[PDB]
Amino acid sequence: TTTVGLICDDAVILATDKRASLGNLVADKEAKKLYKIDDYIAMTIAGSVGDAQAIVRLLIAEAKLYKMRTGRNIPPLACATLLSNILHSSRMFPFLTQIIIGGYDLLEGAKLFSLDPLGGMNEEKTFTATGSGSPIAYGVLEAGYDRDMSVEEGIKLALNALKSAMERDTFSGNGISLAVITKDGVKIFEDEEIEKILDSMK
Amino acid sequence: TTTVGLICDDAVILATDKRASLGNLVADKEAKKLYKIDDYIAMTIAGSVGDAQAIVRLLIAEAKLYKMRTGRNIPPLACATLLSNILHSSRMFPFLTQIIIGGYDLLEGAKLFSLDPLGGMNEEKTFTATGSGSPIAYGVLEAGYDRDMSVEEGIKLALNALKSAMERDTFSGNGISLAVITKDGVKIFEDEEIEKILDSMK
Amino acid sequence: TTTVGLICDDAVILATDKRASLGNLVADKEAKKLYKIDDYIAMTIAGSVGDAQAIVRLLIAEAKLYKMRTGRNIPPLACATLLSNILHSSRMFPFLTQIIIGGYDLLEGAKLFSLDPLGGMNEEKTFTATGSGSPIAYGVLEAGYDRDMSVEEGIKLALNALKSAMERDTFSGNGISLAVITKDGVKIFEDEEIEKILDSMK
Amino acid sequence: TTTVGLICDDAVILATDKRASLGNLVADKEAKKLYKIDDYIAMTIAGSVGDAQAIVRLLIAEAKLYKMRTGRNIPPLACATLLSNILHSSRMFPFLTQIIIGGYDLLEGAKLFSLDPLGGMNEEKTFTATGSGSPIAYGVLEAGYDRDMSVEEGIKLALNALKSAMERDTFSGNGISLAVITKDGVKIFEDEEIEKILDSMK
Amino acid sequence: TTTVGLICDDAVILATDKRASLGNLVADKEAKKLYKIDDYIAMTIAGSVGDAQAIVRLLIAEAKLYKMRTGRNIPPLACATLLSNILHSSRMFPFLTQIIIGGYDLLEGAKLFSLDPLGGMNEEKTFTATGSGSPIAYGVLEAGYDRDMSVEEGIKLALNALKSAMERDTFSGNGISLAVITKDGVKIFEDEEIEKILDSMK
Amino acid sequence: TTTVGLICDDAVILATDKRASLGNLVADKEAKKLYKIDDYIAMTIAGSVGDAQAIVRLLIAEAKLYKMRTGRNIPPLACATLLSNILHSSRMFPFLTQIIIGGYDLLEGAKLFSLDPLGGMNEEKTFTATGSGSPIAYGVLEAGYDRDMSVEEGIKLALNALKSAMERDTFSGNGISLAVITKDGVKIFEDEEIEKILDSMK
Amino acid sequence: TTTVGLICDDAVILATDKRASLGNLVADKEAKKLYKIDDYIAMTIAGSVGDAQAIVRLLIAEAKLYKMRTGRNIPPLACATLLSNILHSSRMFPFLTQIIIGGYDLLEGAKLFSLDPLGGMNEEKTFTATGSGSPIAYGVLEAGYDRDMSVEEGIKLALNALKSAMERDTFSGNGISLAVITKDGVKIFEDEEIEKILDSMK
Amino acid sequence: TTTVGLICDDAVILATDKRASLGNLVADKEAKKLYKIDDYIAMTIAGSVGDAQAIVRLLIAEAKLYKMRTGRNIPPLACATLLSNILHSSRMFPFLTQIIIGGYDLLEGAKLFSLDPLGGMNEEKTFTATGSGSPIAYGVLEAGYDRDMSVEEGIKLALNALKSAMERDTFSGNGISLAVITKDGVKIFEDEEIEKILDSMK
Amino acid sequence: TTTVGLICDDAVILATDKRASLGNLVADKEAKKLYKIDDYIAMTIAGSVGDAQAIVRLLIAEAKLYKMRTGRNIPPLACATLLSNILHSSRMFPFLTQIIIGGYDLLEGAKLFSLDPLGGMNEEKTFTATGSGSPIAYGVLEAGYDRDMSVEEGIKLALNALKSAMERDTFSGNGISLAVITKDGVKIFEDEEIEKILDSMK
Amino acid sequence: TTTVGLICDDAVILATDKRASLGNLVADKEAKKLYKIDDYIAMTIAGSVGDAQAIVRLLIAEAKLYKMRTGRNIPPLACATLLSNILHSSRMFPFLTQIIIGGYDLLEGAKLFSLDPLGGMNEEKTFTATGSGSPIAYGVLEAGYDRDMSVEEGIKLALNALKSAMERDTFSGNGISLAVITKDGVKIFEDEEIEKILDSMK
């Protein structure tokens, strides 16, 4: 339970922690928290699994539909304003969970949106992160981030948020996943190759 | 969480604080709290995000519709009386959130409306503010407001309220936004330019 | 319930509000909230009446005793750390309440101290206020206060903090009392004269 | 929150306190609490704003309707029994709020009705009041009232209740609105002229 | 439970309500609420009977003692500051009950002191009333009082407060007792004679 | 809230207390607690006003209807068993309120029915009372009643209960009204003539 | 649990109800609730037995002690004020129970006192009663009582209170005990002879 | 409420945030959170003010005491193991509050200590931090620290922990205080010179 | 209440514990916890018997139906994604209980899925387990498992988790049950034969 | 918080995990949980830090004193039954926390004692563990322990428990620490060397 989103020049970087946290017990030694909904968009779930779980499937299906009914791949800032709506439906109700959506706007460029359980949404121009061990990761960014950085200088800083949080949060910190959305697509990093990085790092 | 409205001569001014406040954690370094719904009206959200979030959208439509179904741009003191009703509906229900709406009536001139989560609505003739750190902001105005203080001496005083509150409230105070509605329109100030002012102040 | 304190040049100013408040009812149209313990130090009680009330008597005596036994009028920052200890003796216990002590140190000059019901103490180099109607007062000061504003520009600002709180708090604002401690003494303004100022103001 | 109703010879008097009360804060230096529904009837809310707020609107309508549907301007003692019912409707439900209606029945004359949030209704032959600061106002009336006290000795007495309450109730006491329903119509006093009275008084 | 105090020129007046209130039931058709401790001072008890009850006897003793050990009938403002302490002894403890003491100070003249169960003390320069139905009695005063109202205009106004509350309070209002302390002594009015006034009145 | 009913020979008597009770405050110096539904039957509400209030109207309408659809003035013991059902419909629900109905059944004669808010009903052949201040009234009866005490000895005994309870109950005892149903009709006593009796009494 | 006290010319009467009440069960077909402590004084307990039980014994001794220590049989209005203190001793503590003491003072005549478990005390000049079925008994007295009702018209009025209550209170009403304290002594009525009276009545 | 500590080669660094936090309101624009008790040791308080306030004084005394009674300046890890004890004395009790102490041991060298409100102690060989915004600050350290980072690379890093935490924490971030203890002494940095650093940085 | 699953080369293993635990009493010396739903998949419940019981049935039909409607034996990772759905429907509602599904995908091979009462789902590539005494079982696997192991070293380890749990858990551990799914089928081990193994083990 | 102890041939092994867990945050990357109290006994705390902390010191003292007072190094099972007693003294009191003591008795040999916060104690002949993630460690033991497993096979097992716990427990497992007591002494392993083992392991 720990995610990070940030814009660095061209596109947007997203990373999580493959750690499922069943009270005292470590339940999953590898649990996805990073999903690609559409060819230009993807997201990170934080918090109530079975809840976000559905919120993913109960959404991708609304994307890979809008794409069809009207060509354009659900423009991110539009697909987002669903979630803002989807959640808030369950305000009167019990809903819950965190969420970051990061995808490339057909035209308007890269976009990064943050999302609270109720339905609060904000476009994060700089960087944002969420999770059990968010404020740990946060501190990393708020003092290691510059408007420009790079394609490279992003995914580095990126890990190094998780690197701290993951070893300073009881609940986050088992394995790590990462994908980057850019104009031409979305790359899920197959674990093995991820690792390369912090090796070349410190 | 801190906003401000006041009538000053010609038109009406509004301001917020782009700070989002996830309990202990500062969550958004730039959260919009000031929205224009119609070419002649604008409002300010204080409180429950994803709640006030929807009430915006679930109100803007209603405008850029009334506008259409009947020419006159939803006269402000009518649109307001919608929220008094749009709110009160969820009294039996869990609604909540603050709100200031101001706009230049086709004819009756400038108008400024406070508003509570229940549905209580009041026309403010002078100046009113809302937000976690509002009572701070309040002192400012109620010892810095005259009946007729220029198109300038208002947006000055406006800031200064936030200046205070922002730096004397755990919850408010990260960046600032502002717009002034007047007969001929509604001006969203692009961050950069706001600044000039408190530079030209103290 | 709404007190202020501030250091303007020479010495330090103090101001209360003669308003006692019994839940709904207004109980005292004139309650002293400003007490002078020792010829060079004066203090303001805020909150739990008969609890503060004693902490007064149960202290003045300690002063006009120290003074005697060792000449030197209990230097302020030394009387204060008394309260820090006096209070914190009833930490285990149910003590409670607010308090501002401001005195002229024989030689160290002007001093201003803030105080919480536990024992938390702090020297205010600038200004501080306390009370049910505090964060109103506070908004006035934080944006109407300069390192060096006369003995005049201080008692003015002193009033306009109370002027705000008093008529933007349900609990502050029946009458006002004001005294100023300065090297040679401590003036307890006798109502009538106080009023002279907001007349000569706006 | 503090309203008064009383009968004096000819017709009936109503007066409020333009004071809004967000707990500690004072939220509206100027809030209407006296509404005229029908050309011959007028009412004063006391208590939950947005609840009362609607109950005005969700009633005025039924008035200027019954009026059209059957000539006669909804005779007061009948409109009232609506409320008795309109309220008791949300008995099974969370309704709430006080009220006083006073009107001149086409023929029966002056009438004045007390009203609790449940639906409890009682015609007041003499004088009645209600609101946060009601029992203050009361003492005044119960010892400043005689069967036949002129049109004048009415509205004089009236302010003087509010005069007491507004200045002995943490929650009442900011401004005062007054109107008088009499056979020929319903006079809403525009702030300025009202004051004239306590000038001519003591 | 509803007592009054007020300072009219010469000396000071005190009035009670001989009405005891055992919850639903009216338990005593005649319960003294006004007590003379010392030939120059007198007090009224409000609320917790068997508590105030002790606080009376547990005190008059203290007075007609100090009196002896040192001539000077225990000056009022000094006796009073006993209760300030007496009560606040049992803050740490479960104490409670209201109080008004009023005496003629050997020299300083007339005094009037209010007193809450914690121990909070204040001298009342004008008028002050305590008791289940106090807020009624108040309004009477706050709008029937002038600096210099005759020895007569005093006891007149004194009853008319209790006249009000006694018939607008479920707990007060079964009979009434009055005494006026003046330089030379303290007059307990023997029921029958009291009655006089409200008959020469209206 | 203190009503009485009792069968004295020919017919039946009912009496109330015009005293309304808003918690601490006495809110209505005259509140009708005795209603005549049909020319042969009358009732006395006790307790939840706004609730009983409806229950009178939402009933008389049934009476003067049955009365129409089939001549016979809805027999008492039959309208009674309505209530029994009427009430118990809202058992599943939140209903409440006390009740006594007494009428002259076309043939069966005089009737008297007790009634609790759930739906429990009993024919009282003797006498019965309900009201915040009932049990007092009761004692009067249970030791001032005989099978055959005249139409007179009836309404003498009837006041003298109230006499008691009205000055031994915090909640009852402001004004009194009385009506007697007998074969030929139902007598509402206009206050004035009522009094006549306790004058002729002791 | 139901007792009575009242003054009738010469002396003072006291009556109880031998009925014990273990919640649902009826636990003593015959329990004393009237105790003679001193040759000139007698008292009635209502409420927590084992508590009162003590308060009797832990008092009796104090009388038949003071007696010896100083000739005069503890004057009632003095012994009484013990209790006032004996109770208020366990205010800080969980003491509880009612009481009526009545005796003939060596010189001052007859005396009758009411007593609440806190320590609240009042001389009753007229008539008073207390206990589970007190308010019932009261009604009787409040309308069957006159300043000067014989030695007989007293003890008669007496039973008849109990008569009502004992047959209208779930908790009182099993057998009855009575005694009368008059100058020369205190008479304990042995059940049989008591009886005689209501045989001679109605 | 955000302190940090860390061991960099020679000696040890410590840093706070002069931000006090009365819940919603920011109470102190400059609250000391760093204290030097003895020429060779210094500590930081985080959390319960008036509790740790004491704990400081209530310890300083015992340092500059031990020192005398036996020359040697109270060795750090011996001073520490007082707190461990000075806290756990109030386990049975309501004590509370965080803490770091750090000094240069006579011979053993630089020492740093972590301390929880119970009495939890550990020696921190690397770096540690505490307070409302602690984990934010942590993150910084955990990915920005090396065993042997210059005296300089460590006061750099420290700020930046705070830089972070202070603007990612509703409760931290008003001003910054820093000191460094090393063999020869303890340097408290006077606000102005602190500043130099993040000017020469980013 | 203690199940296990893990993939070993070819296929997948499952095991339970035939113990049901009725609070303090052992209620079932043999309760099935392992269910085959379709010829190529098998699942294990843990926890709320009669809820899961249903979820078995209310599932085996949705299997052997899809199977018919479209040949393909409801592929595992889809069937599962029913349960991720079937559960969450009753998120809003009171649904609960553990679960592990695992069967041979037609083509994709061996699959293993965990599942929580809310409907979170996580494919396990290695091994996982659930139930009152899970973690005990866990510790065994996590330190006795290798990517390959074998068909044999599989079911050997598997028991050996249960051997621990069942003898270190108050709620697990009455007998064991075992089945393996592999491409061609799904063996349910008939008590007797299971045994063999820990005979040929330690 | 996850400790272990098991007897193996000659002597006794212990082990912990240097992980401290301030709720959600990891507060100590290395916190000591394994303590030597006497040259022949060693112990391991688990759980409540500053309490246990104390129970160590407030114990080691009692060791090396008995030592001196009477030569024989406090024999373990006697030492132990201190703690059974030292604990329970504060059952009446809030004590708490886990514990295992392990020492070579002068003659009887090797001893291993488990201990609960109330004071229960059991010597373990085989193996026992404790701390938040204890049972995980447990399952490793109960299935990897033989009566006679060398000095080596023990400490190998030992870590191996920890290996699971630490890697399946939210609150255990930041680094590890180890010590073996044996006739001639007590080896506290200094991190670096420990490591060697799981290198020569799997």
mmCIF file of C-alpha atoms in Angstrom, chain J residues 79-191:
data_model
loop_
_atom_site.group_PDB
_atom_site.id
_atom_site.type_symbol
_atom_site.label_atom_id
_atom_site.label_comp_id
_atom_site.label_asym_id
_atom_site.label_seq_id
_atom_site.Cartn_x
_atom_site.Cartn_y
_atom_site.Cartn_z
ATOM 1 C CA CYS J 79 16.018 -15.631 38.969
ATOM 2 C CA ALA J 80 13.081 -16.577 36.827
ATOM 3 C CA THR J 81 10.622 -16.881 39.686
ATOM 4 C CA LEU J 82 11.543 -13.366 40.540
ATOM 5 C CA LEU J 83 9.869 -12.172 37.378
ATOM 6 C CA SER J 84 6.864 -14.395 37.876
ATOM 7 C CA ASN J 85 6.651 -12.393 41.183
ATOM 8 C CA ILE J 86 8.010 -9.015 40.028
ATOM 9 C CA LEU J 87 5.318 -9.087 37.289
ATOM 10 C CA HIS J 88 2.387 -10.112 39.344
ATOM 11 C CA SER J 89 3.015 -7.424 41.966
ATOM 12 C CA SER J 90 1.514 -5.224 39.323
ATOM 13 C CA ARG J 91 -1.443 -7.327 38.264
ATOM 14 C CA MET J 92 -3.366 -5.112 40.715
ATOM 15 C CA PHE J 93 -1.564 -2.649 38.572
ATOM 16 C CA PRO J 94 -1.199 -1.998 34.815
ATOM 17 C CA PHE J 95 2.020 -3.990 34.163
ATOM 18 C CA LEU J 96 2.692 -5.799 30.865
ATOM 19 C CA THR J 97 4.970 -7.423 28.246
ATOM 20 C CA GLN J 98 6.542 -10.736 27.035
ATOM 21 C CA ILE J 99 9.880 -12.443 27.995
ATOM 22 C CA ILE J 100 12.034 -15.557 27.741
ATOM 23 C CA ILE J 101 14.918 -16.102 30.177
ATOM 24 C CA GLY J 102 17.709 -18.574 29.366
ATOM 25 C CA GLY J 103 20.766 -19.445 31.444
ATOM 26 C CA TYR J 104 23.043 -22.339 32.379
ATOM 27 C CA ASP J 105 22.342 -23.358 35.932
ATOM 28 C CA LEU J 106 25.495 -23.821 37.966
ATOM 29 C CA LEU J 107 24.729 -27.561 38.094
ATOM 30 C CA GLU J 108 21.186 -28.491 36.917
ATOM 31 C CA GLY J 109 22.266 -27.490 33.423
ATOM 32 C CA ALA J 110 20.336 -25.623 30.775
ATOM 33 C CA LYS J 111 17.096 -23.779 31.458
ATOM 34 C CA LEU J 112 14.560 -21.966 29.207
ATOM 35 C CA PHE J 113 11.667 -19.918 30.740
ATOM 36 C CA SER J 114 8.613 -18.307 29.141
ATOM 37 C CA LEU J 115 6.888 -15.460 30.828
ATOM 38 C CA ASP J 116 3.615 -13.522 30.507
ATOM 39 C CA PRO J 117 2.809 -9.927 31.479
ATOM 40 C CA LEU J 118 0.721 -11.013 34.416
ATOM 41 C CA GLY J 119 3.382 -13.365 35.730
ATOM 42 C CA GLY J 120 2.577 -16.741 34.421
ATOM 43 C CA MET J 121 5.776 -18.665 33.877
ATOM 44 C CA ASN J 122 6.578 -21.944 32.225
ATOM 45 C CA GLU J 123 9.966 -23.574 31.857
ATOM 46 C CA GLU J 124 10.164 -24.905 28.301
ATOM 47 C CA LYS J 125 11.945 -28.225 27.815
ATOM 48 C CA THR J 126 11.829 -28.005 24.072
ATOM 49 C CA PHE J 127 11.368 -24.600 22.407
ATOM 50 C CA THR J 128 9.201 -21.510 22.640
ATOM 51 C CA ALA J 129 9.012 -18.086 20.956
ATOM 52 C CA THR J 130 7.104 -14.815 21.316
ATOM 53 C CA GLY J 131 6.321 -11.356 20.048
ATOM 54 C CA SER J 132 3.849 -9.870 17.582
ATOM 55 C CA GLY J 133 4.846 -12.274 14.792
ATOM 56 C CA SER J 134 5.561 -15.201 17.059
ATOM 57 C CA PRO J 135 3.478 -18.080 15.760
ATOM 58 C CA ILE J 136 4.990 -17.729 12.282
ATOM 59 C CA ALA J 137 8.376 -18.346 13.867
ATOM 60 C CA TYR J 138 6.569 -21.110 15.742
ATOM 61 C CA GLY J 139 5.514 -23.202 12.745
ATOM 62 C CA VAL J 140 9.150 -23.346 11.669
ATOM 63 C CA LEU J 141 10.173 -24.692 15.055
ATOM 64 C CA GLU J 142 7.371 -27.245 15.656
ATOM 65 C CA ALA J 143 8.335 -28.788 12.319
ATOM 66 C CA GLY J 144 12.137 -28.500 12.394
ATOM 67 C CA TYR J 145 13.092 -29.460 15.883
ATOM 68 C CA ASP J 146 14.530 -32.694 17.181
ATOM 69 C CA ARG J 147 15.449 -33.515 20.763
ATOM 70 C CA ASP J 148 19.176 -33.681 19.996
ATOM 71 C CA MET J 149 20.080 -31.177 17.285
ATOM 72 C CA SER J 150 23.606 -29.831 17.696
ATOM 73 C CA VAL J 151 24.851 -26.471 18.855
ATOM 74 C CA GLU J 152 24.681 -25.787 15.089
ATOM 75 C CA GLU J 153 21.422 -27.316 13.850
ATOM 76 C CA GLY J 154 19.811 -25.189 16.547
ATOM 77 C CA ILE J 155 21.073 -21.705 15.750
ATOM 78 C CA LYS J 156 20.437 -22.662 12.116
ATOM 79 C CA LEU J 157 16.781 -23.451 12.906
ATOM 80 C CA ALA J 158 16.632 -20.370 15.143
ATOM 81 C CA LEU J 159 17.375 -17.777 12.480
ATOM 82 C CA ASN J 160 15.194 -19.795 10.203
ATOM 83 C CA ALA J 161 12.151 -19.154 12.329
ATOM 84 C CA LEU J 162 12.973 -15.477 12.299
ATOM 85 C CA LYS J 163 13.491 -15.790 8.540
ATOM 86 C CA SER J 164 9.785 -16.558 8.086
ATOM 87 C CA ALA J 165 8.357 -14.305 10.819
ATOM 88 C CA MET J 166 10.307 -11.267 9.654
ATOM 89 C CA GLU J 167 9.220 -11.989 6.144
ATOM 90 C CA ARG J 168 5.557 -12.570 7.004
ATOM 91 C CA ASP J 169 4.990 -10.065 9.718
ATOM 92 C CA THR J 170 4.140 -6.395 9.460
ATOM 93 C CA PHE J 171 5.798 -5.688 12.809
ATOM 94 C CA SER J 172 8.812 -7.958 12.955
ATOM 95 C CA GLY J 173 11.912 -8.329 10.884
ATOM 96 C CA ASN J 174 14.204 -5.400 10.553
ATOM 97 C CA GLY J 175 17.504 -7.195 11.016
ATOM 98 C CA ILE J 176 18.152 -9.877 13.545
ATOM 99 C CA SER J 177 20.222 -10.496 16.719
ATOM 100 C CA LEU J 178 21.398 -13.684 18.364
ATOM 101 C CA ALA J 179 22.991 -15.092 21.496
ATOM 102 C CA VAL J 180 23.774 -18.504 22.946
ATOM 103 C CA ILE J 181 24.207 -19.088 26.660
ATOM 104 C CA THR J 182 26.262 -22.150 27.591
ATOM 105 C CA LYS J 183 27.988 -23.418 30.711
ATOM 106 C CA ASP J 184 31.135 -21.290 30.460
ATOM 107 C CA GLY J 185 29.340 -18.146 29.172
ATOM 108 C CA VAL J 186 27.079 -16.111 26.928
ATOM 109 C CA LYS J 187 27.909 -15.112 23.312
ATOM 110 C CA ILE J 188 26.264 -11.858 22.080
ATOM 111 C CA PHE J 189 26.811 -12.076 18.358
ATOM 112 C CA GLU J 190 28.010 -8.896 16.788
ATOM 113 C CA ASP J 191 25.914 -8.473 13.663
#
